[PDB]
Amino acid sequence: AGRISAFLKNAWAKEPVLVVSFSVWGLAIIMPMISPYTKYASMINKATPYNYPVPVRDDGNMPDVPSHPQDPLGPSLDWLKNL
Amino acid sequence: MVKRFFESYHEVPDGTQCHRKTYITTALGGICGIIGSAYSVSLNPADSTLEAVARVGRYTFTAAAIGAMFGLTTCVSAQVREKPDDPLNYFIGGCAGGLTLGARTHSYGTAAMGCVYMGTAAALFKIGKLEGWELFPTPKV
Amino acid sequence: MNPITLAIIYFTIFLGPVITMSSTNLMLMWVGLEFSLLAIIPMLINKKNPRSTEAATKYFVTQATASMIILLAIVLNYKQLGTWMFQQQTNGLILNMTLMALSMKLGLAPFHFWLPEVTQGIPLHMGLILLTWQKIAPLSILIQIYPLLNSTIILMLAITSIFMGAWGGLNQTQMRKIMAYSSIAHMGWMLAILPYNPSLTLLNLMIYIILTAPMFMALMLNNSMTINSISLLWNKTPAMLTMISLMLLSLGGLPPLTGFLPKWIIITELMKNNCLIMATLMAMMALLNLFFYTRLIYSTSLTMFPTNNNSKMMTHQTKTKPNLMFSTLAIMSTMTLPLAPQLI
Amino acid sequence: PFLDIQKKLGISLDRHFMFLSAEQPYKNAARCHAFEKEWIECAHGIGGTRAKKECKIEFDDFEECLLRYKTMRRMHDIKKQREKLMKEGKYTPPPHHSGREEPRP
Amino acid sequence: PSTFFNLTMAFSLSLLGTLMFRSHLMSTLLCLEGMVLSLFIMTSVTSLNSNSMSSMPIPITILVFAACEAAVGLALLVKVSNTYGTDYVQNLNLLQC
Amino acid sequence: FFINILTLLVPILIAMAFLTLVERKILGYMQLRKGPNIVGPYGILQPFADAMKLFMKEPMRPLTTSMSLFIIAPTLSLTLALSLWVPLPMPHPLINLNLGILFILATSSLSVYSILWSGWASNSKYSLFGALRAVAQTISYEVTMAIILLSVLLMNGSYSLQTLITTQEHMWLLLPAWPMAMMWFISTLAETNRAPFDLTEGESELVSGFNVEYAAGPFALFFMAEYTNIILMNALTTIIFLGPLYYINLPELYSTNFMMEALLLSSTFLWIRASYPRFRYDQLMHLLWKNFLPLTLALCMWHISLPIFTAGVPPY
Amino acid sequence: RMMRWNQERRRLLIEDLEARIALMPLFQAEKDRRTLQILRENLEEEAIIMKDVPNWKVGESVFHTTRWVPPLIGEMYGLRTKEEMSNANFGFTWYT
Amino acid sequence: NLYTVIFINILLSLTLILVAFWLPQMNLYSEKANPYECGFDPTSSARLPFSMKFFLVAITFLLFDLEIALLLPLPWAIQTIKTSTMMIMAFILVTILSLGLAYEWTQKGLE
Amino acid sequence: MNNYIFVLSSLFLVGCLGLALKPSPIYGGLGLIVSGFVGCLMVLGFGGSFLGLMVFLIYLGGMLVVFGYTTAMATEEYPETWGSNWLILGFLVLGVIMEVFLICVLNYYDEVGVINLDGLGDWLMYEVDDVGVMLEGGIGVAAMYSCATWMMVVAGWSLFAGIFIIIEITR
Amino acid sequence: PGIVELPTLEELKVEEVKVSSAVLKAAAHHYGAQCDKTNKEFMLCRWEEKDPRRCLKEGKLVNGCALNFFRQIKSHCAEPFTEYWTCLDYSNMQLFRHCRQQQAKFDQCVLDKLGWVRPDLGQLSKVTKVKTDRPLPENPYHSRARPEPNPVIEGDLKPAKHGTRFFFWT
């Protein structure tokens, strides 16, 4: 460990450019395992209305989706606007 | 319109209308001489543009003479024998086309080999049109 | 040169045929053809003699022109049809451009001119990949379009490849150029049966690799560039002389051996097509291949040629070159005529 | 041959953008998506040779939708007959095609 | 329509340019690059007229194998030009042996 | 529209000549001289006299040249540099181009073509060395130019140049990207071809590089496109990496903040021009490709990493 | 601060896009009422134009199915003026 | 708008070229219009084969240009549902783009 | 601007003719930069602003590097221009005479075929969606990051192996 | 080959709405909160029939609902809506980052003189079930006749009859 520590210590003294590129590349490697916000961008891109979501036909099985837009029961975004 | 012109050879039977028949095979010999001289120019380049245009004119003239003598002797044999369904009428025309080939290249052994090969090629062409199974078949099995 | 680069380029020349097989989009199998082209060109120019640089640049301009005419056909099919896959109800012009550029990328006559010139540049350890493994990639498109092609243009290209591969290997006495015109003649054979049976042109392609890969291993072990250099086998190594006798006669396609079964099954599925004159012109003109392979027979095996005094040096020195693959693909080619119903 | 690697594995490396009616980046429709979807749903389970005979009306209708060739001929003929009637004098100057029209909305 | 017919006339003239050789093989590489440029223009007007956004990176992979193939040919012409001095295709007459 | 393109294009030519004036004045102040203050009221008349005098300077049609390409190069360079200015955002852009920074990157890649056209068509060996080192400056600058213009614009998330104005109202952009600003600065020195990274018009390397055979008005057009590119990419570094205050009711306060920040950035551009020794293209390709290319790729990796690290992705 | 600005800017885009997603069927009812009106103006001024030329029905569509084919830019505004045609087909693209 | 600013810009640059040409006097001679190599007779023609040595770095520029062209749709690619898919695969793509330069820097390709 | 893309594609045919009659490749690089700019505004008039502009950037960079290559290696003592040889300029005159004859025979001789010259302007883009937001082609090019990931992986591995190809060849 | 059918101009003309961008987008949340049954009903008509000629009455009464909404916001709260659109129309970006301090005045007006609730973040992008009086068509695509499949072969796999059937082998 001491030989490789003296190798990476002298590389950061002499030519630190490639080893700091490798350091922040390894930081980008170890980012999304411990990133807590990494499961929010995909559902934000799901929640943006680029298309028209087609309103479904009412058949009266269960109220899994709301029959009215502005009432807050249903799939909301109130934990996303508070971010 | 080229294929409709070239298919005027077949629906008129042999023994009649020799001028249109020799026009069709003269045009066929000219087209085959044009593509053979184009291959000869693109294989062996001439030293001059005048030499290249003399090469394509000489090869087109000799192959058109081969086709014209083949169709002329074929229709002359059809006149003198009155047998439109005879492969010997194409054998004599193919031998005369090979003799025209060997007279134009000035070698009598090549004239005899061209007589034998072009006569059996014209005999197989007339007999292949007589039985009717095509040289280029549609895929049917 | 570097083994990391050689492992990458060997994986690339493996992958390009694999992706031109696996990709069912014809744009992505054009991508596989381009992969095979770009992967095999540094292995053409690896020896860096000027004859191989000339062979690599003639190869590059010919397969680049073929790849761009193929890409013209795929983008023209996206204009006319709107889908990527070649449907049955498209025109004949795009399929004829596809056939002409695939024929030029293969090596069928009258685009035969680049193939002896490309195999003259390089020794045969890469020329196996250049001559045989560059037939897996352009014939991976023709199976996918197998009832779509114009059969007159198919059989015209096949008869010009039979005629010109018979007529181009006679005078020219280099071994790689003889095997190139052998590949042009057997290219005409396995593109003759293309609009009728795809399994039999797959069979004839497989018979060509299992014929020619022990042939190029036998030339690879001894570096026999010329007719006299393969005639020197009876002083250098007389072990493969008896096997090269049967393998040259099988690549002739004489009846008791394996290479009869290509011409026998092509005549079998062409007389079922009521194709008389073109099939007999195909089968009559294949004997000039047997003329220059009997010249190969006469130089190698059945007449011992004059050898040199430095052949006793090769007699003294031990030999450890050829693998198990030479013997097993040699016998597993040439003595499988009782396994003839189990191949089709 | 075909060699069916994606068909064996079940994962579409390039099969999911083969036709014009494939899935799109945020669902923006290709032109004649309905026509190509009707042609593919016609063409499934019939094969290519019988698809040529049976879905000929649907292939010609989809090909007319994409190339718009008889639509181009129809617009060219109505513009030529409008030009000939304008030289003749039967045609009035169009108020809805002369720029003086009431625009909706 | 008319733009695509002028595109395929430009492609036919680019094929007529790249199926002959006049001065250098570098100008044939230039003809292949113009050929694949008009091929790109064909691909983009088809994938933009059909309003298909799925087949839109097919011009990207067409340009990728275009400029990679031209890159391969430029290293090839580097090797044949520093071998031969000048890169004329009329000096390439030692492969008939 | 015509009054707008006159008040955009004629004051940018007058301000480019006055930039040449204050370039020579603050350059001579760096070199302890007072500068050209005699011929104008505190020297406000000298590059106007240069642009006047180079009109009736004699142009050159040499024997060895091709005169059509030789005269089509500097007119394309002037049209290039003066029509690169139109997708600049400002308060409100004259061209509201939807992906205009790719047009900026494409026409600055076109900016290293007229110099090669000039260096070939001049038909001198000196101009051919200047043209080959312009190719070497392309080989140096272009991929790090695109990666710095890609990765920090991924934090804005759009190639519309108008959307960068609303991004940095309260804070600057060199505070989230400080190595990207200085690496953008040393790559835009290579695109701008100023005296750290000037390697294709240098009096100590060649006889002024690619301007060997170019006299008079075409040399005035090349100098015009040169200093238009200087103030142009000073405004590019100003409009990307530093964020002025935006009030939507008052764009004039934003414009004078642009004025003071662009004057200090053009002052540090001609200060960094007149300070340093001038490179050699071996270590130009070496420090960019070996050192600063994987640092741009690794901060490009970290800009891949940032919108999944936090906050979602930027707007369209 | 880029995190806070990116989250408030995505909230701003989703607010403006929520205004768009509530505004589309007013736009869509405007859209089909115009593109049926300009096609009916094409059908009205087809019977004036080609009543003399035979075997050509007015209101004819070459598509075989009875489903609503989407009208093109050429079939929609092809009978109108060249200025309105260029403003239609070059509208978003040349507003530059 | 972009067409008319390109048109009026090339027209003003063309009339700058015309007022460069036709405004001074016109008198040339052969010693004046001889080419410049610090004032000497031509030892060789300038159009001759130049064997420059940055050729592999130039083709690495062409491949890196192609690589940044596939890198270029990234602000639209970040607006997708498959963020982890484009994340892992774009990480792989720019990693092998760095690894090609790492092999060139190892095997002395940039000299 | 009704005949805009038709006069641009005619300029494309003139530039590809100037490339096709094959001068010394310096003039071919100038004419192909002209035709690449022509194809850039050809795609940039259609509606997809990303594609033709990034291939304008690519063709500017790659044409600049092959332009440095053809002023480095592939040149001779007397460079053949378009006007230096009268076969090239006479073939240019014959080619523009042939394209005048081609638009003549497609304009008023027979007027039979899929190619039409009376259909100018209106048959340029067939249907573009007017109310939608995601109509810019950048997300369509960016579809290779999400849906068409395999050809993206294939092209990235192709340029990795191409870097290995050029370092194998040029040693 | 047939003749297309379109409604007449008197049917296609309506009580036409001429309402600009800032007055649309300023109360676009307030439009969609108070027209949503009609709004998603007309959108479900368009999405399930794929046809402009089958939704003329729904388009007429959604324009009647829109004109009732705009007459209501004219008659009740005119002054903060006129200040809100004349200050939102100054910004050419027309996002809601420039108008919140008078949007609060518009919210004060709609709570005082109207009593509505403005819809909050992320609620107008949801799918909606709305009751339709129209019966669902069995072929909404107007598709043609379905072609038959290939007649499949079923049963036990018998072996190859009398050998391998290749010439003289058995």
Short mmCIF file of N, CA and C in Angstrom, two decimals, chain F residues 1 5 9 55-64 71 75 78-79 82-83 86 102 120 123-126 128-129 132 138-139 142-143 146-147 150 154 157 159 207 212-213 217 281 286 289-290 293-294 301 304 308 313-316, chain H residues 1-2 4-5 8-10 12-14 16-17 20-21 24-27 32-38 43-47 50 54 58 60-61 64-65 68 71-72 74-76 78-79 83 87 91 94-95 97-98 101 105 110-111:
data_model
loop_
_atom_site.label_atom_id
_atom_site.label_comp_id
_atom_site.label_asym_id
_atom_site.label_seq_id
_atom_site.Cartn_x
_atom_site.Cartn_y
_atom_site.Cartn_z
N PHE F 1 -36.16 46.43 -39.36
CA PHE F 1 -35.14 45.38 -39.36
C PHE F 1 -33.84 45.91 -39.94
N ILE F 5 -30.24 46.22 -38.20
CA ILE F 5 -28.99 45.59 -38.65
C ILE F 5 -27.93 46.65 -38.96
N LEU F 9 -24.51 46.37 -36.94
CA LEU F 9 -23.32 46.02 -37.71
C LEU F 9 -22.34 47.18 -37.87
N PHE F 55 -7.52 50.96 -47.86
CA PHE F 55 -8.33 50.96 -49.07
C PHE F 55 -7.51 51.33 -50.30
N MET F 56 -6.74 52.42 -50.23
CA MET F 56 -5.94 52.86 -51.36
C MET F 56 -4.49 52.38 -51.28
N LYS F 57 -4.18 51.53 -50.31
CA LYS F 57 -3.05 50.61 -50.47
C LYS F 57 -3.32 49.69 -51.66
N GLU F 58 -2.26 49.37 -52.41
CA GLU F 58 -2.38 48.52 -53.60
C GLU F 58 -2.65 47.07 -53.22
N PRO F 59 -3.69 46.44 -53.76
CA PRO F 59 -3.88 45.00 -53.57
C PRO F 59 -2.91 44.20 -54.43
N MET F 60 -2.84 42.91 -54.15
CA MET F 60 -1.89 42.02 -54.80
C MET F 60 -2.62 40.92 -55.55
N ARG F 61 -2.35 40.82 -56.85
CA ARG F 61 -2.70 39.65 -57.65
C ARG F 61 -1.39 39.02 -58.11
N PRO F 62 -0.86 38.02 -57.39
CA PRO F 62 0.41 37.40 -57.78
C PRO F 62 0.30 36.50 -59.01
N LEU F 63 1.47 36.12 -59.54
CA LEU F 63 1.56 35.14 -60.63
C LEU F 63 1.11 33.75 -60.19
N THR F 64 1.60 33.30 -59.05
CA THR F 64 1.46 31.92 -58.60
C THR F 64 0.09 31.61 -58.01
N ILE F 71 -9.29 35.82 -53.63
CA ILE F 71 -10.17 36.94 -53.28
C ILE F 71 -11.48 36.48 -52.65
N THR F 75 -13.31 37.92 -48.08
CA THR F 75 -14.71 38.34 -48.09
C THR F 75 -15.59 37.33 -47.35
N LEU F 78 -14.79 38.06 -43.58
CA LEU F 78 -15.53 39.21 -43.05
C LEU F 78 -17.02 38.90 -42.87
N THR F 79 -17.62 38.20 -43.85
CA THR F 79 -19.01 37.75 -43.75
C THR F 79 -19.20 36.74 -42.61
N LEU F 82 -18.71 38.79 -39.15
CA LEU F 82 -19.80 39.72 -38.90
C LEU F 82 -21.17 39.07 -38.91
N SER F 83 -21.29 37.83 -39.40
CA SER F 83 -22.53 37.07 -39.29
C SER F 83 -22.41 35.94 -38.27
N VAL F 86 -24.62 37.70 -35.00
CA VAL F 86 -26.08 37.79 -34.93
C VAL F 86 -26.80 36.79 -34.01
N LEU F 102 -24.88 26.00 -31.51
CA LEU F 102 -24.30 25.08 -32.47
C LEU F 102 -23.96 25.80 -33.77
N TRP F 120 -3.24 28.45 -48.53
CA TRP F 120 -2.97 27.68 -49.73
C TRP F 120 -2.93 28.58 -50.96
N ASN F 123 0.04 30.76 -52.26
CA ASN F 123 1.06 30.01 -53.01
C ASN F 123 2.48 30.37 -52.56
N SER F 124 2.66 30.50 -51.26
CA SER F 124 3.97 30.64 -50.66
C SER F 124 4.20 29.48 -49.70
N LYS F 125 5.48 29.13 -49.52
CA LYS F 125 5.83 28.11 -48.54
C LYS F 125 5.56 28.60 -47.12
N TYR F 126 5.78 29.90 -46.87
CA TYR F 126 5.48 30.53 -45.59
C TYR F 126 3.99 30.50 -45.27
N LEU F 128 1.97 28.35 -46.59
CA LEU F 128 1.64 26.94 -46.43
C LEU F 128 1.98 26.43 -45.03
N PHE F 129 3.06 26.94 -44.41
CA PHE F 129 3.33 26.61 -43.00
C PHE F 129 2.28 27.22 -42.08
N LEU F 132 -0.84 25.03 -42.51
CA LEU F 132 -0.70 23.76 -41.79
C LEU F 132 -0.74 23.94 -40.28
N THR F 138 -6.66 23.85 -35.37
CA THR F 138 -7.95 23.16 -35.40
C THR F 138 -7.90 21.85 -34.61
N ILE F 139 -6.83 21.07 -34.85
CA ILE F 139 -6.53 19.79 -34.19
C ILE F 139 -6.40 19.98 -32.68
N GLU F 142 -10.50 22.10 -31.28
CA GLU F 142 -11.90 21.99 -31.70
C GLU F 142 -12.69 21.04 -30.79
N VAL F 143 -12.07 19.93 -30.38
CA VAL F 143 -12.78 18.96 -29.56
C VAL F 143 -12.93 19.44 -28.11
N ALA F 146 -15.74 22.03 -28.24
CA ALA F 146 -17.05 21.41 -28.23
C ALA F 146 -17.40 20.77 -26.88
N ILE F 147 -16.41 20.24 -26.15
CA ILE F 147 -16.74 19.59 -24.88
C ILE F 147 -16.99 20.62 -23.77
N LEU F 150 -20.33 21.86 -24.51
CA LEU F 150 -21.34 20.84 -24.25
C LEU F 150 -21.65 20.66 -22.76
N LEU F 154 -24.87 21.59 -20.54
CA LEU F 154 -25.75 20.54 -20.02
C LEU F 154 -26.35 20.95 -18.68
N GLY F 157 -28.97 22.87 -20.10
CA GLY F 157 -29.83 21.85 -20.67
C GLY F 157 -30.49 22.20 -21.98
N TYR F 159 -29.68 24.17 -26.08
CA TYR F 159 -28.79 24.87 -26.99
C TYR F 159 -29.37 26.19 -27.46
N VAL F 207 6.96 34.96 -41.63
CA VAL F 207 6.74 36.38 -41.93
C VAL F 207 5.23 36.59 -41.88
N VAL F 212 0.99 36.52 -45.72
CA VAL F 212 2.22 36.74 -46.49
C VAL F 212 1.93 37.53 -47.76
N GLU F 213 0.96 37.08 -48.54
CA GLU F 213 0.70 37.65 -49.86
C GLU F 213 -0.44 38.64 -49.85
N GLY F 217 -6.81 46.10 -48.70
CA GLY F 217 -8.15 45.76 -48.28
C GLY F 217 -8.45 44.33 -47.88
N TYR F 281 3.65 24.51 -31.59
CA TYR F 281 2.47 23.68 -31.82
C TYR F 281 2.63 22.23 -31.37
N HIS F 286 0.33 18.88 -27.40
CA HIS F 286 0.65 18.04 -26.25
C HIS F 286 -0.11 18.45 -24.99
N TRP F 289 -4.14 17.91 -25.88
CA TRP F 289 -4.54 16.53 -26.09
C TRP F 289 -4.14 15.61 -24.93
N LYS F 290 -2.94 15.77 -24.37
CA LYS F 290 -2.54 14.90 -23.27
C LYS F 290 -3.09 15.39 -21.93
N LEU F 293 -7.39 17.60 -22.64
CA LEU F 293 -8.48 16.79 -23.20
C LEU F 293 -9.11 15.80 -22.20
N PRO F 294 -8.37 14.97 -21.43
CA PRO F 294 -9.08 14.16 -20.42
C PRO F 294 -9.58 14.93 -19.21
N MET F 301 -17.67 14.12 -17.65
CA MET F 301 -18.18 13.01 -16.83
C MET F 301 -18.88 13.50 -15.57
N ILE F 304 -22.11 14.83 -16.69
CA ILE F 304 -23.06 13.72 -16.80
C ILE F 304 -23.63 13.41 -15.43
N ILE F 308 -28.19 13.71 -12.33
CA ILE F 308 -28.68 12.55 -11.59
C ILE F 308 -28.16 12.53 -10.16
N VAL F 313 -33.25 17.13 -14.05
CA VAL F 313 -32.59 17.52 -15.29
C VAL F 313 -33.02 18.95 -15.59
N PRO F 314 -32.29 19.74 -16.39
CA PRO F 314 -32.71 21.13 -16.67
C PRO F 314 -33.90 21.19 -17.62
N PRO F 315 -34.59 22.34 -17.68
CA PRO F 315 -35.71 22.50 -18.63
C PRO F 315 -35.28 22.49 -20.09
N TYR F 316 -36.29 22.39 -20.95
CA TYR F 316 -36.12 22.31 -22.39
C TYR F 316 -35.75 23.66 -22.99
N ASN H 1 -34.48 35.93 -42.07
CA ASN H 1 -33.69 36.87 -41.29
C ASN H 1 -32.21 36.50 -41.32
N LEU H 2 -31.93 35.20 -41.13
CA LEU H 2 -30.56 34.71 -41.25
C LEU H 2 -30.09 34.75 -42.70
N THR H 4 -31.18 37.01 -44.98
CA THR H 4 -30.93 38.39 -45.36
C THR H 4 -29.75 39.00 -44.62
N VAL H 5 -29.37 38.49 -43.43
CA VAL H 5 -28.16 39.02 -42.82
C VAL H 5 -26.91 38.40 -43.47
N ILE H 8 -26.85 40.45 -46.94
CA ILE H 8 -26.35 41.82 -46.82
C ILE H 8 -24.93 41.85 -46.25
N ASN H 9 -24.50 40.81 -45.53
CA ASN H 9 -23.14 40.76 -45.03
C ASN H 9 -22.16 40.40 -46.13
N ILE H 10 -22.52 39.45 -47.00
CA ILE H 10 -21.66 39.14 -48.13
C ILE H 10 -21.74 40.22 -49.21
N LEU H 12 -22.00 43.58 -48.37
CA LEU H 12 -21.12 44.61 -47.83
C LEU H 12 -19.66 44.17 -47.87
N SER H 13 -19.38 42.88 -47.70
CA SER H 13 -18.02 42.39 -47.84
C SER H 13 -17.57 42.37 -49.30
N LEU H 14 -18.50 42.15 -50.24
CA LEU H 14 -18.19 42.23 -51.66
C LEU H 14 -17.93 43.67 -52.11
N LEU H 16 -16.80 45.93 -50.03
CA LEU H 16 -15.49 46.20 -49.42
C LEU H 16 -14.35 45.67 -50.28
N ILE H 17 -14.55 44.51 -50.92
CA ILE H 17 -13.57 43.95 -51.84
C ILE H 17 -13.46 44.81 -53.11
N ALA H 20 -11.77 47.92 -52.22
CA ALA H 20 -10.35 47.63 -52.09
C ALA H 20 -9.68 47.61 -53.45
N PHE H 21 -10.34 47.03 -54.45
CA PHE H 21 -9.72 46.87 -55.77
C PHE H 21 -9.72 48.17 -56.57
N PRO H 24 -7.75 52.36 -55.50
CA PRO H 24 -6.40 52.86 -55.82
C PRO H 24 -6.09 52.74 -57.31
N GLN H 25 -4.86 53.12 -57.65
CA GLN H 25 -4.36 52.98 -59.01
C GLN H 25 -4.06 51.52 -59.32
N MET H 26 -3.96 51.22 -60.61
CA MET H 26 -3.74 49.85 -61.08
C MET H 26 -2.46 49.82 -61.91
N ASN H 27 -1.38 49.36 -61.29
CA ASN H 27 -0.10 49.18 -61.98
C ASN H 27 0.63 48.03 -61.29
N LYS H 32 6.99 42.79 -58.83
CA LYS H 32 6.03 43.10 -57.79
C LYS H 32 5.17 41.90 -57.43
N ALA H 33 4.65 41.20 -58.43
CA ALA H 33 3.73 40.10 -58.19
C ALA H 33 4.44 38.75 -58.11
N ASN H 34 5.77 38.73 -58.00
CA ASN H 34 6.50 37.52 -57.67
C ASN H 34 6.16 37.08 -56.24
N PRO H 35 6.12 35.77 -55.95
CA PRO H 35 5.73 35.34 -54.60
C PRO H 35 6.85 35.55 -53.59
N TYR H 36 6.47 35.47 -52.32
CA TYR H 36 7.30 35.94 -51.22
C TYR H 36 7.87 34.77 -50.43
N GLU H 37 9.20 34.71 -50.39
CA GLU H 37 9.95 33.82 -49.52
C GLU H 37 11.14 34.59 -48.97
N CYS H 38 10.84 35.79 -48.42
CA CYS H 38 11.80 36.86 -48.08
C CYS H 38 12.63 37.28 -49.29
N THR H 43 13.11 28.34 -55.12
CA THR H 43 13.94 27.14 -55.01
C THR H 43 13.15 25.89 -55.32
N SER H 44 11.87 25.89 -54.97
CA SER H 44 10.95 24.83 -55.34
C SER H 44 9.57 25.44 -55.44
N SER H 45 8.67 24.71 -56.10
CA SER H 45 7.27 25.09 -56.08
C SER H 45 6.69 24.84 -54.70
N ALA H 46 5.74 25.70 -54.30
CA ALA H 46 5.10 25.54 -53.00
C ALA H 46 4.17 24.34 -52.98
N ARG H 47 3.46 24.10 -54.08
CA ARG H 47 2.62 22.92 -54.23
C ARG H 47 3.54 21.73 -54.51
N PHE H 50 4.22 17.59 -48.94
CA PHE H 50 4.66 17.91 -47.58
C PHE H 50 4.47 16.69 -46.69
N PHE H 54 2.06 15.29 -37.91
CA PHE H 54 0.91 15.25 -37.00
C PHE H 54 -0.27 14.51 -37.62
N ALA H 58 -4.08 14.04 -36.40
CA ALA H 58 -5.13 14.61 -37.23
C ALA H 58 -6.29 13.64 -37.46
N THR H 60 -6.94 11.24 -35.32
CA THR H 60 -7.54 11.18 -33.98
C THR H 60 -8.44 12.39 -33.71
N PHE H 61 -8.14 13.55 -34.33
CA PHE H 61 -9.07 14.68 -34.31
C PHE H 61 -10.35 14.35 -35.05
N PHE H 64 -12.29 11.98 -32.93
CA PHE H 64 -12.80 12.68 -31.75
C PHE H 64 -13.89 13.68 -32.12
N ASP H 65 -13.82 14.26 -33.33
CA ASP H 65 -14.89 15.07 -33.90
C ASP H 65 -16.16 14.27 -34.09
N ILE H 68 -17.53 13.60 -30.53
CA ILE H 68 -18.29 14.71 -29.96
C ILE H 68 -19.57 14.97 -30.75
N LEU H 71 -21.74 12.75 -29.02
CA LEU H 71 -21.95 13.35 -27.71
C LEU H 71 -22.94 14.51 -27.77
N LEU H 72 -23.07 15.14 -28.95
CA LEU H 72 -23.84 16.38 -29.10
C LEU H 72 -25.35 16.38 -28.80
N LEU H 74 -26.87 15.40 -26.20
CA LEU H 74 -26.99 15.22 -24.75
C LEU H 74 -27.96 16.15 -23.98
N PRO H 75 -28.12 17.47 -24.28
CA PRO H 75 -29.19 18.22 -23.58
C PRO H 75 -30.62 17.79 -23.92
N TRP H 76 -30.84 17.12 -25.04
CA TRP H 76 -32.13 16.49 -25.30
C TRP H 76 -32.17 15.06 -24.77
N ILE H 78 -30.78 14.10 -21.95
CA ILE H 78 -30.99 14.15 -20.51
C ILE H 78 -32.48 14.29 -20.17
N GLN H 79 -33.30 14.73 -21.12
CA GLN H 79 -34.75 14.78 -20.96
C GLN H 79 -35.38 13.49 -21.50
N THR H 83 -33.22 7.37 -17.66
CA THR H 83 -32.09 8.17 -17.20
C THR H 83 -30.90 7.30 -16.79
N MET H 87 -27.46 7.04 -18.70
CA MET H 87 -26.38 7.34 -17.78
C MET H 87 -25.26 6.32 -17.85
N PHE H 91 -21.83 6.91 -19.90
CA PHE H 91 -20.62 6.72 -19.11
C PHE H 91 -19.64 5.79 -19.82
N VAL H 94 -18.28 7.76 -23.22
CA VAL H 94 -17.22 8.75 -23.02
C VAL H 94 -16.03 8.16 -22.24
N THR H 95 -16.23 7.02 -21.55
CA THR H 95 -15.11 6.28 -20.96
C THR H 95 -14.23 5.65 -22.03
N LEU H 97 -14.13 6.75 -25.11
CA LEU H 97 -13.56 7.91 -25.78
C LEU H 97 -12.31 8.42 -25.05
N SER H 98 -12.31 8.38 -23.72
CA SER H 98 -11.09 8.69 -22.99
C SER H 98 -10.06 7.57 -23.09
N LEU H 101 -7.79 7.76 -26.25
CA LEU H 101 -6.69 8.70 -26.02
C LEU H 101 -5.69 8.15 -25.01
N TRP H 105 -1.85 7.86 -25.88
CA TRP H 105 -0.85 8.43 -24.98
C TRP H 105 0.11 7.37 -24.46
N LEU H 110 0.33 10.61 -30.00
CA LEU H 110 0.13 12.06 -30.02
C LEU H 110 1.41 12.84 -30.26
N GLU H 111 2.53 12.16 -30.52
CA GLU H 111 3.78 12.85 -30.79
C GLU H 111 3.94 13.07 -32.29
#
